[PDB]
Amino acid sequence: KVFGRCELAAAMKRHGLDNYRGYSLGNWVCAAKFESNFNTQATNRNTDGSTDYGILQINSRWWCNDGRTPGSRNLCNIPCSALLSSDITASVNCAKKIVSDGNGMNAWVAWRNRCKGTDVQAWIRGCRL
Ligand SMILES: [Cl-]
Ligand SMILES: [Cl-]
Ligand code: NA
Numbered sequence: 001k002v003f004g005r006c007e008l009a010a011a012m013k014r015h016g017l018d019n020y021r022g023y024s025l026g027n028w029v030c031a032a033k034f035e036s037n038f039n040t041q042a043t044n045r046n047t048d049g050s051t052d053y054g055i056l057q058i059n060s061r062w063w064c065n066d067g068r069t070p071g072s073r074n075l076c077n078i079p080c081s082a083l084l085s086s087d088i089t090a091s092v093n094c095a096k097k098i099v100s101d102g103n104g105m106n107a108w109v110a111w112r113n114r115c116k117g118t119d120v121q122a123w124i125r126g127c128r129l
Contacts, residue, residue, distance in 0.1 A: 001039075001040045001041070001086035002037075002038055002039050002040075003032075003038040003039075003040070003055070004038070005029060005033075005038070005123065005124075005127070006124070006126065006127035006128065006129070008029055008032055008038055008055070008088075009025055009029050009123070009124045009127045009129060010127065010128075010129060011088050012025060012028050012029065012032075012088070012092065013025060013129055015088060015089060015092040015093075016092070016096075017092050017095070017096070020096060020099065021096075021099045021100055021104065023099065023104070023105055024120065024121070025123075025124050025129070026120030026121045026122065026123040026124045027105060027111070027115060027120045028095075029120075029123035029124060030111065030114070030115035030118070030120045030123045031056060031105060031108045031110065031111040031115055032055050032056055033123065034110040034111070034114045034115065035052075035055070035056050035057035035108060035110050035111075036054065036055045036056065036057055038055065039055070040054055040055050040084060040085060040086055040088065040091075041054075041084050042054060042055070042057065043084070044057065046059070046061075048061065049068070049069060049070065050069045050072060051066055051068075051069070051080065053066075053080045053081075053083040053084055054083035054084050054085075054091045055083075055088055055091050056091050056095050056108065057108070057110070058076070058080075058083050058091065058094050058095065058098065060072055060080050061073075062075055063075050063076045063078075063094055063097070063098060064076055064078045064079060064080035064082070064083055064094065065078070065079055065080060066079070066080040066081075075097060076090075076093070076094035076097055078090055078093075078094060
């Protein structure tokens with residue numbers, strides 16, 4: 001599923017991500033924009049053999065099991081495929097773990113490089129929330 005901007009904002013709020021660990025909804029929407037272009041089915045292989053899955057490009061090196069990432073962990077206790085669903089529940093639950101891991105949203109390199117410090121409120125502007 002390819003979310004619209006306000007549509008994703010609403011689903012993230014519904015699942016308790018707005019202001020989670022102090023990150024406003026615009027931060028989460030901006031990260032989703034540049035990680036997946038709002039596409040729940042996005043997958044991308046990393047040079048180290050791991051793969052990033054879903055709307056927030058969660059990495060199989062640490063967070064989900066895809067059965068082909070040697071030495072990886074599965075700290076969200078989830079098949080990586082569950083992160084590709086049209087319902088964003090699993091991606092949100094796992095992202096909550098990731099953003100609580102110590103480095104905040106810097107875990108998402110695209111967030112650090114493209115959202116951090118910017119006018120992230122633009123991403124929810126005009127949204128009925
Ligand atoms: Cl915001
Ligand atoms: Cl933080
Ligand atoms: Na893994």
